[PDB]
Structure 1
Amino acid sequence: YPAKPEYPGEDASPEELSRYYASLRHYLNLVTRQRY
């Protein structure tokens, strides 16, 4: 589980959280290239 933080939810702003979402998606986008 390379960097698997928990999501905030609908607590933060619709833009601020949307930015943070990139860090979450980036993790998955790093797992979408499994090797060995």
Structure 2
Amino acid sequence: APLEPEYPGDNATPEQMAQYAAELRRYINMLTRPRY
């Protein structure tokens, strides 16, 4: 209930996407956790 990232929808501009990807990356990080 990272509620989630947010994604515009496509491509906001030639980077957003980048940004955006960074946001979920964090997201996963957070959930995964490994443990172990």
TM-score (norm 2): 0.50
